[PDB]
Swiss-Prot record:
Effect of residue 149 to F: Expressed only 2% of the wild-type hemolytic activity
Domain of life: Eukaryota
GO cellular component, as recorded: extracellular region; nematocyst; other organism cell membrane; pore complex
Function field: Pore-forming protein that forms cations-selective hydrophilic pores of around 1 nm and causes cardiac stimulation and cytolysis. Pore formation is a multi-step process that involves specific recognition of membrane sphingomyelin (but neither cholesterol nor phosphatidylcholine) using aromatic rich region and adjacent phosphocholine (POC) binding site, firm binding to the membrane (mainly driven by hydrophobic interactions) accompanied by the transfer of the N-terminal region to the lipid-water interface and finally pore formation after oligomerization of monomers.
BP-aspect Gene Ontology terms: cytolysis in another organism; monoatomic cation transport; pore complex assembly
Location of region: N-terminal region: 11-30
Family named by the database record: Belongs to the actinoporin family. Sea anemone subfamily.
Protein name per UniProt: DELTA-actitoxin-Aeq1a
Covered range of the whole protein: 36 to 214 of 214
Species annotation: Actinia equina
Length: 179
């Protein structure tokens, strides 16, 4: 199956093991990117802009993130160009003009470097891209992923209870809830 129009479950039924199964049954590729954000913010989201710095996932993705639903995501680098892991930013509109941007980053080689993820609110004005995060030291601070979990406010007000699992294949299990 591939063109399925219902491969998503409530932000409660999923589990880290199901997620492991998600990237496992995602091709016998060396690297596997799996994301599952339990969004319990209580706000309706709509995909505004999505672009990857190195790897990829899909050209177009769902544009709705209601309360009580986990956002599933998966990537497998660019493949076409040079050797590069999975780095990218996803941005959804929260209402009239607020966009929660999430960063993902992972090198296509095992060494000292690790995964990087950063969630933050960006007002609905000007398309976010490389030039938005680069040059200016305002939005260039991603969190290093590591096998564990920790709570912290995203910025707007709510707090994310989760973390990013490294060990080659990365999985993001962050549950956003009220602070």
């Amino acid at each position: 199956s591939a063109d399925v129009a219902g491969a998503v479950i409530d932000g409660a039924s999923l589990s880290f093991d199901i997620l492991k199964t998600v990237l496992e049954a995602l091709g016998n590729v060396k690297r596997k990117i799996a994301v599952g954000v339990d969004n319990e913010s209580g706000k309706t989201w709509t995909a505004l802009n999505t672009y990857f710095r190195s790897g990829t996932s899909d050209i177009v993705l769902p544009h709705k993130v209601p309360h009580g639903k986990a956002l599933l995501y998966n990537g497998q680098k660019d493949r076409g160009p040079v050797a590069t892991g999975a780095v990218g930013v996803l941005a959804y509109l929260m209402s009239d003009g607020n966009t929660l941007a999430v960063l993902f980053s992972v090198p296509y080689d095992y060494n000292w470097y690790s995964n990087w993820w950063n969630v933050r609110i960006y007002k609905g004005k000007r398309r976010a891209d490389q030039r938005m995060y680069e040059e200016l030291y305002y939005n260039l601070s991603p969190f290093r992923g590591d096998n564990g979990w920790h709570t912290r406010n995203l910025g707007y007000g709510l707090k994310s209870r989760g973390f990013m699992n490294s060990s080659g294949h990365a999985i993001l299990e962050i549950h956003v809830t009220k602070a």
